[PDB]
Ligand binder design. Structure first.
Ligand SMILES: NC(=O)NC1=NC(=O)NC1=O
Ligand SMILES: NC(=O)NC1=NC(=O)NC1=O
Ligand SMILES: NC(=O)NC1=NC(=O)NC1=O
Ligand SMILES: NC(=O)NC1=NC(=O)NC1=O
Lengths: 295, 295, 295, 295
């Protein structure tokens, strides 16, 4: 038999970093979870029990901490590029590094209208993520994303005009609840290496911010024809506002809220325009995906 | 053998309610998860296969929706009291109702600095909870709580002066990270029944707010001697600000962030005053509990 | 204000122990998760910032490992008693120790019909648990339990004869699916101390085994009138087979499987006696509890 | 902008099916969770608000139940092929169907050494999975897998001979614990369509069984040089025993169990050959992947 593909590394490496301003006394914290997987001339560790080609995953973990000690950890797109570049420059037989980072929220607390210098709150479970692929002789590919952004609108969602055949029982509607957990990814144009990534550093936070804002405002303002239609609108705007983005992908569940017919009880009216109490459904859920690119 | 205790009901009943202002066009949503357990003269369902004494848990679920249709669902302390009172008044053989409610966050979105009329965000996984016990001839006992409030301060926590013996390896410190997930419960004085609960309705939201504020400000401002000392300070204030509270209980994990010694690598200095990169620990964790009452 | 109650300690302490038979070469492993909470004359750590009364939770963790090194870790009822007794004997101001243990399954693998000497499988997520309360001058109270035992029977469950009023929509049935996750606790008579617990050591594993067997056989053989009726039958048997048990408690969800009406499609018959495809419901669920004691 | 890729459907569709033998009275149950995502000429639902091209995800759900009513649901490789073929044959504009199925364990109980006719136990959280891609004019691609198989061996694992540089702190060892959660996937040769899949039906369960057996026996018997080496051995055997398999992929975490140095306490010896108590580590973990194909 033959090794067709192989990668190995360390997952679930939790990292905290604090930045302390002597001058102001203000502290700023960063917490992430890191995955690093390596590819290279390592097939003999699998086939021949040759561990000489293995950079121990324990050493990978060490490297993550040391790199965080010696470099900025923000924006995550920069830190991931620095970490992956290290592995391929450092080891002659390692030719690709795959770095995934999840950035956890630590939002500064405001106490008495004043931001506190060293106290933070996890204000949501929403994440900011990066996937960075560093490949010898092919540059640095970065996919940035937000995930875990949970939203609901209580009206101004519609779904009518869909295919109707003998498998269909769903009624057309002109007014429903729409709720989802947003997963949005923007894929950057290939970068030639670290210098190029460093030259674009301000764009990373700005674009994350823009993707978030557009996502929020479009969801809230669109009188949605369907999940499909609304998510296309978000993707189009982001592409229009950042030219270094090649594609935008969205993955949106439809988390259903069902009406409850209470007419069996004292003629109680709780459907259609009288609908006030609903049953949120844990499963199943619609799942709608789109990848939008440039024309 | 003999039935010493028995309760039965329905758990994990998810409920959504929307309120719509004709006038303004503003919509407001509520989402909760409800548990209702009943006690009474029901032992023969266990011992004799007598189902006649059983109010089907399916009917309990129905009752939850109908009650939500016909009554306010906020504050949860009121809605739980109304729901539990129903069961004991309605069924002659049911003498206690236990209602647990978890209130989920749906915070109105602000778009362009303007609050949106019908779009919401789950801005955190923090919950507002109530436990309501309705007991025939003994009134209504309510425990209110907040849970899932996750915080961190990066300095102004200490821990020195603890017992040292042959089981001790922990070093005293005058500067550490302190992070926790706050669970805080305030127990109301017994209420005689629904009228009394309705007369105090404005106090429920106000007290939740106060408990939250005090928790936040004390955590941020206290130069903490230990988790014990800091949580006592929070409990004392809440009791001072709401006289209808008999006790306050706190349950606080200590989620450890460990220093990482990097001196083995190029003499890198990452401990004590040079500590910048830390390893968050998933387990084990300290767990500190306090119940504070009136003197 | 005043401290009404206080306890503190360490949670989520994971422990592995291996036992190695020189003679046979057979190895046996144990893995548990331990919680230890202490009570005593410790109020001044809360009120006065007096850490001198605090046995650091870090030291508690150390103590757990050392105790496991020097004593048997099985049965968990014995190990918990030894651990809690340590704290109250060792520290003059500590008067109660609360030890919770979760025992994780590592079942020996059989390879080629032969049990392997050192390879194991987590054959299920079912747990064996103990809660041990060690109180100065009041002995040792032990509650043993099994949890996470998930079962289903596809027929020979009934539910008819329940209360019917204007909140009822559930139809009586003489044939349904019954599925649950078993939580069963047996509470031992108070023990005077460690000697007494050691004298009963063989009974702990035997009784766990009996509780499991009875639970399984009764669920499978009872033509169940309801969850109530069936669980009473299990509790009664266990009490009959172990006299040192004072009470048995069961907590059983009813995890509903709903019929699906497919008659709207080509007159397809999938209800009642033609019911073949069902929709498992994630929520809500019935919840039925019983505590059975001696007459 | 332009739609580069699009798929939509229904996720988390839970399904139960029972099979009842009139003759024997024996019942057999199946429970799965189904995801179906469709691709086709559906871009205008995204760009033009044209819902006419949309087969409602609600109808997809209906279709899953109806198909399960009218066809075998086992082996999952067959049921997935039947379901995906339906969508592409039925709808002219739908050209690919992606079906993912998770098969949940319901193992027949043995009571008194006799298998029970209608009672089952979830004997483990291990899953059997399939991914089936049905593409108009390109046949049926099936990936089969097992996941959630958690194992541990307490000796006969080694790790020495790895790369050592200034990032390395890990000590070589000739005796350690090895624990993992097995994820193994076998990819079938492309099938031309349903007839071909039906002709190979007996091979699906047999191969799942073989992959399981080989995985178990190799883990238990290999004096492992590393995770890499051991997993290569498993993949090679499976390929040798089933010729219709093109590739085998394994994804194996290394769930670390750390020694604990107790020498600081009364010279207690708990390392190296005296190692008896270990601390299981929740994170980070090694992650090792391999795809093995034919030479
Ligand atoms: N995964 C292995 O086989 N050995 C590993 N354990 C470590 O700590 N580093 C490795 O690379
Ligand atoms: N729990 C039972 O035994 N029967 C129950 N199922 C329901 O739907 N209502 C009950 O009370
Ligand atoms: N919980 C605290 O305030 N300090 C604690 N951290 C520890 O490691 N031991 C304690 O008791
Ligand atoms: N996802 C949507 O926009 N509408 C959907 N809801 C459904 O129930 N079926 C759909 O396709």
């Amino acid at each position: 038999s033959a090794v067709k593909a192989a990668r190995y590394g360390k997952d679930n490496v939790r990292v905290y970093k604090v930045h302390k301003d002597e001058k102001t006394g203000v502290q700023t914290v960063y917490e992430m979870t890191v995955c690093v997987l390596l590819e290279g001339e390592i097939e003999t560790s699998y086939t021949k029990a040759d561990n000489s080609v293995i950079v121990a995953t324990d050493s990978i973990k060490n490297t993550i901490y040391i790199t965080a000690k010696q470099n900025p950890v923000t924006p995550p797109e920069l830190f991931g590029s620095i970490l992956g570049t290290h592995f391929i420059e450092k080891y002659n037989h390692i030719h690709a590094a795959h770095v995934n980072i999840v950035c956890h929220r630590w939002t500064r607390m405001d106490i008495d209208g004043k931001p506190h210098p060293h106290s933070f709150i996890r204000d949501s479970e929403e994440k900011r993520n990066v996937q960075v692929d560093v490949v010898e002789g092919k540059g640095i590919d970065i996919k940035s994303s937000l995930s875990g952004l949970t939203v609901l609108k209580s009206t101004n969602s519609q779904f009518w005009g869909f295919l109707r055949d003998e498998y269909t029982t769903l009624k057309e509607t002109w007014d429903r609840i729409l709720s989802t957990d947003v997963d949005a990814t923007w894929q950057w144009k290939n970068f030639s290496g670290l210098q190029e990534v460093r030259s674009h550093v301000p764009k990373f936070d700005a674009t994350w911010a823009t993707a978030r804002e557009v996502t929020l405002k479009t969801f809230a303002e669109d009188n949605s024809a369907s999940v499909q239609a609304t998510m296309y609108k978000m993707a189009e705007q982001i592409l229009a506002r950042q030219q270094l983005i090649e594609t935008v992908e969205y993955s949106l569940p439809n988390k259903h809220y069902f009406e409850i017919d209470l007419s069996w009880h004292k003629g109680l009216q709780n459907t259609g325009k009288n609908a006030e109490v609903f049953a949120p459904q844990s499963d199943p859920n619609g799942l709608i995906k789109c990848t939008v690119g440039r024309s």
